[PDB]
RNA sequence: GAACUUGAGUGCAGAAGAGGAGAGUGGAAUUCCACGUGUAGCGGUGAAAUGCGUAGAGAUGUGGAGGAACACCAGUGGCGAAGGCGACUCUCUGGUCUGUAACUGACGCUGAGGAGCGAAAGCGUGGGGAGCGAACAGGAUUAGAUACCCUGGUAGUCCACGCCGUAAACGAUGAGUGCUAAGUGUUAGGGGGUUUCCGCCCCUUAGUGCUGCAGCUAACGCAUUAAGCACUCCGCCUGGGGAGU
């Protein structure tokens, strides 16, 4: 559902473009944030904001991205299983790994998977590297993953008939 | 027309019923490629009908090789009559 | 089961395939609904409407057609509850506080015609007070009092007003709603179908839903 | 199946008229070119002029025939001068 | 509009109905277009066959 | 032409989830009737039904959509090809996202699936991932 | 190895089509030719001029010769593998679609290499030459004008055969098959519910347009005529230039 956003957030920022629009005078500069947002529970965001300064478009950004927040699934503080997310010509697969490994990701896939709080993560773009198609990637590939509780529910199966 | 299919229907009857069964098939292509050589004979400039030949002669070589596969002797037999060698 | 009303329903040959599951076919070229998909609708639509008002969001009663002004009107100020007859303004629920700020501008301005002073120029008072005070209250309806985001939201045709639809369902506000054969019956969150340009089936069916929020006040 | 539909010229008697027509019989049965059945339209005014004439005798043979006589037909057709027309068209 | 030979049941146009076709040529000798006689393509395909076989037996005229 | 039928089926029945539908009418060879008997011991049909006639037959296919809006099967996936066939030693059988999803295997003792295959320690083709 | 009939094809029955090749015929008009009318212009341009013209032009009537394309039909209409194919008729001949049930019973698809077709220009040989028209000449515009404009006009355009074998040869989209909402014209069928009909509605094919859902896509857009979801086969790409050298 819509995530209420109620909760305590770490709010760091990937990048701040400069990004101008030309007129008559000339070049008319804004600064485009974006954003991601979330604790490290479960709950992860991005957002994006625009301003004539650095720091109202990251506040804009922190907004809109508490707007909009995903839930993501922790199984054994790791994901569940292997998934690529394919958000327009940004394809990044996700591995679970081992416990010890860590959060192996580039820039803005290593700052969603650190603030989701899941731990151990293989992970890999294949894919442009525009900061905001590979988090829409990163989030195409962690909406769709599945709980094995809640895909144990769907077969009308228990959840040992699964994983075992 | 309709004297010709029709006689050489009746003179490659295997059974009564056979319209299909390749012999029949590959008999009324026989004569109609026939037919449509002399008629290239009289009209060279003529190159659609050409095509046409084509996929005839594409049609019965593969019926060819479809009694081939099937019946040796009644291959060998067709060959015989038709003298299509 | 007939209860009361007129309506087989709408439109010709634009019409969407996801009604399939709701609808007849006349020779007419004008469809007719399946009623037997609509009674067990509309009863279930009548108990949780009862549920949410006997919860308390107030109800949003929202009609823009020349059919749904008088009957939006006058069943939503039968109610009591906060209605649209005119134009819905891009963005009241979910550019919220803006709103807010225009409301309370109309509502300092029809307390100042007649507690506040009404001398201030010769017409300073038509310029201003007139002019503003006839679009603010023909477009602001009985939204008016509103203070506080509502909990659902009646409409009278969804694709005559797919941009309140739009950002209600961006909001997450369940909506009850009369649809069209040419209406999607996915975007509203609780589908009736009927008739929404006779005056009759819609006065009705206000009328039910409005008396449906009415037993459940106490 | 074919029908043969053609114009005599006007300025031509009546027993010569029988001889033009006995004469395309004739060519007609060279064949074996049955003459299932005739007619004559008579003097009929044509749309637009031919040398310098307003007007023409039409014939109207119906052939079933092996294609060939309507074909010697068309030669000398296109050579006697005591036609204005010619048409075959194959009946279908 | 209406089609005539669908409504008369009428099938091969055959070119001696001089006064038929002579309905269907328009004024100044040309052939009338299909929303204008309001036949079908098939009937129109054969009445135009038909105008051009009696225009060579000067049964319909070319320019008038 | 038509190259395989199996890789059909499975986009017939991916082809039905994407527009949601509820029925399923596939030409029913017999291991397509085997494929669609695991898919429905393994919950992601909720029945399935053979309709035995004279073209070829007719196999039905109930999809199970079990929550408000919610496809079991995501997505659907062929592995070896009529021109690249795919064979697993029982060492390398896949067991996919792993554990939640599972691969149709058909080896020499039955048309099995992951965990039948494993259990019986044999490899064959390899010629479906459902997820 | 044996069966089956859906895929494929034959059979029967219609239907439509500028599908092709050979031959014949027609009516405007353009040009040219001769005669009558008759006199000073005609032609052309943004403006003019070269040209044509009293040796009688342009206009006009009749007649004749010759070539090429076939107005109206004509339409996001049809047919073809593509080039392409628009008067008509006959001769031969290729394919499609529709209704099935009569037959065959997997006989099918793709296809490197090979064989053929292959717009237009061009080449060889012989004809042909009305219009147009590269090249070329004169006049203009212009600083220049090997150009655009105008007046002329060679090869060529045409036909027969032989060669070339190239195009933005385009849907800038290989072929096959299956699945995946709709609305709506249209082309050729078929069938139903009243009417023998007229006609309306409905249904189903195969082809052809537009708008459009999911899905795809970088976007534009495509969307059952896919650029979706799949499988088979082939061709092709791996920075721009150098260089298609």
Not at chain 1, 6 to 31: H, I, Y
Not at chain 3, 166 to 173: C, F, M, S, T, V
Not at chain 4, 56 to 81: H, M, P, T
Request: hydrophobic share 40%.
């Amino acid at each position: 559902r819509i995530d209420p956003s109620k909760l305590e957030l770490e709010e760091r920022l990937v990048t701040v473009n400069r990004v101008a629009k030309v007129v008559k005078g000339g070049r008319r500069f804004r600064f485009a944030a974006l954003v991601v947002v979330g604790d490290k529970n479960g709950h992860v965001g991005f957002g994006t904001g625009k301003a004539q300064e650095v720091p109202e478009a990251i506040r804009k950004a922190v907004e809109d991205a508490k707007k909009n927040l995903i839930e993501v699934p922790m199984v054994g503080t790791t994901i569940p299983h292997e998934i690529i997310g394919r958000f327009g010509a940004g394809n990044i697969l996700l591995k679970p790994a081992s416990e010890g490994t860590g959060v192996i990701a580039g820039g803005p896939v290593r700052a969603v998977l650190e603030l989701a709080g899941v731990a151990d993560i293989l992970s890999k773009s294949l894919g442009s590297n525009t900061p905001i198609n590979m988090i829409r990637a990163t989030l195409q590939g962690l909406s769709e993953l599945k709980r094995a509780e809640d895909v144990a529910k769907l077969r009308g199966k228990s959840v040992e008939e699964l994983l075992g | 027309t309709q004297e010709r299919k029709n006689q050489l229907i009746n003179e490659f009857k295997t059974h009564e019923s056979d319209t299909g069964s390749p012999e029949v098939q590959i008999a009324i292509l026989t004569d109609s490629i026939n037919n449509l050589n002399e008629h290239l004979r009289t009209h060279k400039k003529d190159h659609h009908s050409r095509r046409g030949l084509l996929k005839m002669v594409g049609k019965r070589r593969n019926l060819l090789t479809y009694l081939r596969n099937k019946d040796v002797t009644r291959y060998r037999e067709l060959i015989n009559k038709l003298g299509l060698r | 089961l007939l209860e009361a009303g007129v309506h087989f329903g709408h439109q010709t040959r634009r019409w969407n395939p996801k009604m399939k599951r709701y609808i007849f076919t006349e020779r007419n070229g004008i469809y007719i609904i399946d009623l037997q998909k609509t009674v067990k609708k509309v009863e279930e639509a009548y108990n949780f409407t009862k549920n949410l008002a006997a919860e308390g969001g107030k109800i949003l009663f929202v009609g823009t057609k020349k059919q749904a002004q008088d009957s939006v009107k006058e069943e939503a100020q039968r109610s009591g509850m906060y209605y649209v007859n005119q134009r819905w303004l891009g963005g009241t629920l979910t550019n919220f506080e803006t709103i807010q700020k225009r409301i309370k501008r109309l509502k300092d301005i029809e307390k100042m015609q007649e507690n506040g002073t009404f001398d201030v120029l010769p017409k300073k008072e038509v310029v201003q007070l007139k002019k503003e005070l006839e679009r603010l209250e023909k477009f602001l309806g009985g939204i008016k009092d509103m203070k506080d985001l509502p909990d659902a939201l009646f409409i009278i045709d969804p694709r005559k007003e797919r941009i309140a639809v739009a950002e209600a369902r961006k909001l997450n506000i369940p909506i009850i709603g009369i649809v069209d054969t040419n209406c999607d019956p996915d975007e509203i969150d609780v589908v009736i179908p009927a008739n929404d340009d006779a005056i009759r089936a819609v006065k009705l069916l206000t009328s039910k839903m409005a008396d449906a929020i009415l037993e459940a006040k106490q | 199946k074919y029908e043969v539909m053609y114009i005599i010229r006007p300025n031509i008697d009546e027993e010569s008229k029988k001889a033009v027509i006995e004469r395309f019989n004739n060519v007609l049965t060279s064949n074996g070119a049955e003459i299932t059945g005739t007619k004559d339209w008579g003097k009929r005014r044509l749309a637009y002029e031919i040398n310098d004439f307003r007007d023409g005798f039409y014939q109207i043979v119906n052939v079933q025939s092996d294609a060939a006589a309507v074909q010697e037909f068309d030669r000398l057709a296109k050579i006697s001068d005591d036609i204005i027309r010619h048409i075959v068209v194959k009946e279908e | 509009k209406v089609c005539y030979f669908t409504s008369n049941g009428i099938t091969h146009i055959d070119y001696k109905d001089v006064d038929l076709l002579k309905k269907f040529v328009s004024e100044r000798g040309k052939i009338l277009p299909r929303r204008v006689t309001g036949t079908n393509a098939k009937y129109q395909r054969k009445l135009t066959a038909a105008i051009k076989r009696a225009r060579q037996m000067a049964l319909l005229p070319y320019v008038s | 032409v038509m190259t395989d039928p199996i890789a059909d089926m499975l986009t017939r029945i991916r082809n039905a989830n994407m527009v949601r539908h509820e029925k399923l009418e596939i030409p029913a060879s017999k291991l397509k009737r085997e494929i669609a008997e695991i898919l429905k011991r393994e919950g992601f049909i909720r029945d399935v039904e053979f309709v035995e006639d004279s073209k070829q037959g007719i196999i039905r296919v109930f999809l199970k959509y079990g929550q408000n809006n919610e496809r079991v099967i995501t997505g659907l996936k062929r592995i070896s090809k009529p021109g690249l066939r795919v064979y697993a030693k029982s060492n390398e059988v896949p067991r996919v996202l792993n554990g939640l999803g599972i691969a149709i295997i058909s080896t020499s003792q039955g048309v099995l699936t992951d965990k039948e295959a494993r259990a019986k320690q044999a490899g064959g083709e390899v010629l479906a991932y459902v997820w």
